[PDB]
């Protein structure tokens, strides 16, 4: 058999500077023909992989001519001559010259401009309500870098239980990132208390962003 | 040109499971059928490949038991069955015929009770831009699917990934429009839960009526 090893990690890459990713080969993908059989692909979150090259020098159709590959015939890298916000994704280096066997994958990540999160206070909905349940919902969204802290108050007093955080992958356009906070409570509960606030606190200022209601309003 | 694979199947443990991969304007006659594991943030790993001329199969060793890949040319579909399933057969199983790559089926290892999602519109509170939301709470197994204006309203929006907690997932997703476009042109969450064969579209409906 043939393993393809990659690293997962890589250092994030800063807009539009170069990028280079590594493969090996536990065998030579080097056929007597002269042909290097080493593919790559790109896969983007809840896609199939897509090709980007394949036998090491040809790019697929379509694909931007900024992808390019070379290597020893054990070694290679896929080198990406300046990082644009839609090359995000996890590469795969692959070959199939015994069978077809894929690396474990490296994913790509943009440095860009920090930026602060805006954000969103949402009341449950009066269906949620109606079926005896109370979850409301911050968005954090649009920041960068992905480090975020979310506060939750009911009161003026500090909730840590029934919350629930949910980051998205990089955007493909601006290259942020975007989290959801969830606070579940059941509607008794709910309508025990008035004031609901969600603080956000980012490197981008040493106040939290805050954003607040109150159930009587 | 497509590869249709249901998108979720959802198998008991130690039971077996028969994932179809059918083509749509493509037909399985000549190119090799290809089948393809990826578990959750891992990599891809090629399970085997069936020649649908004479039925020949080639499977990785560690899949050789595990795995019986089938076609059938008069359905146009091929068939990947895996036996005795466990944990670690929960992946994302793509089937792959002549460079095209079929959506997936997530695959399920659960005794756990297939549910509905609730869904849940998110209005603002009682700027320039405005932002809009949809909660998709309770449901099970994995995955949902969701759009904004049947897929036209693809600009300014984030869905969070889903969230396990006691048997049931949660998903959330955003919109942000310019603050002149709603209420004024409507703005529905599409969800669809392929296991429950629930589609629901969900209108985002101001808090308090426009006349107040």
């Known amino acids: 058999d043939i393993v393809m090893t990659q690293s997962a990690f890589s250092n994030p890459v800063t807009l539009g500077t170069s990028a280079s990713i590594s493969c090996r080969s536990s065998?030579?993908?080097?056929?007597?023909?002269?042909?290097?059989?080493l593919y790559w692909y790109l896969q983007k979150p809840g896609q199939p992989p897509q090709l980007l090259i394949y036998?090491?020098?040809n790019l697929a159709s379509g694909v931007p001519d900024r992808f390019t590959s070379s290597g020893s015939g054990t070694d290679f890298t896929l080198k990406i001559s300046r990082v644009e916000a839609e090359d995000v994704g996890v590469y795969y280096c692959?070959?199939?010259?015994?069978?077809?066997?894929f690396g474990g994958g490296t994913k790509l990540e943009i440095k860009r401009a920090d930026a602060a999160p805006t954000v969103s206070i949402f009341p449950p909905s009066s269906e949620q309500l109606t079926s005896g349940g109370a979850s409301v919902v911050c968005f954090l969204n649009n920041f960068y870098p992905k480090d975020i802290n979310v506060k939750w108050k009911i009161d003026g007093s500090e909730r840590q239980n029934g919350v629930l955080n949910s980051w998205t992958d990089q955007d493909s356009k601006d290259s942020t990132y975007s989290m959801s906070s969830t606070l579940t409570l059941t509607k008794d509960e709910y309508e025990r208390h008035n004031s609901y606030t969600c603080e956000a606190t980012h490197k981008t200022s040493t106040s939290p962003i805050v954003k607040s209601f109150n159930r009587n309003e | 040109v497509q590869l249709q694979q249901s998108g979720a199947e959802l198998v008991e443990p130690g039971a077996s499971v028969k994932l179809s991969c059918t083509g749509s304007?493509?037909?399985?006659?000549?190119?090799?059928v290809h089948w393809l594991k990826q578990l959750t943030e891992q990599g891809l790993e090629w399970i085997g490949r069936?020649?649908?001329?004479?039925?020949?199969?080639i499977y990785t060793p560690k899949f050789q038991d595990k795995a019986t890949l089938t076609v059938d040319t008069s359905s146009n579909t091929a068939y990947l069955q895996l036996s005795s399933l466990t944990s670690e057969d929960a992946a994302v199983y793509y089937c792959?015929?002549?460079?095209?790559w079929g959506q997936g089926t997530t695959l399920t290892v659960s005794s756990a009770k297939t549910t509905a999602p609730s869904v849940y519109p998110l209005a603002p509170v009682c700027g320039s831009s405005v932002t809009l939301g949809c909660l998709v709470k309770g449901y099970f197994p994995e995955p949902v699917t969701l759009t904004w204006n049947s897929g036209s309203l693809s600009s300014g929006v984030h869905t969070f990934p889903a969230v396990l907690q006691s048997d049931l997932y949660t998903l959330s997703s955003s919109v942000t429009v310019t603050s002149s476009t709603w209420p004024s042109q409507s703005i529905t969450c599409n969800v669809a839960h392929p296991a429950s064969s629930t589609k629901v579209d969900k209108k985002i409906e101001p808090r308090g009526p426009t006349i107040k």
């Open positions: 065998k030579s993908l080097l056929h007597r023909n002269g042909i290097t059989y």
């Open positions: 792959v015929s002549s460079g095209y």
């Open positions: 304007g493509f037909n399985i006659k000549v190119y090799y």
């Open positions: 069936i020649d649908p001329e004479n039925g020949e199969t």
């Open positions: 692959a070959q199939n010259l015994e069978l077809w066997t």
């Open positions: 036998q090491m020098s």
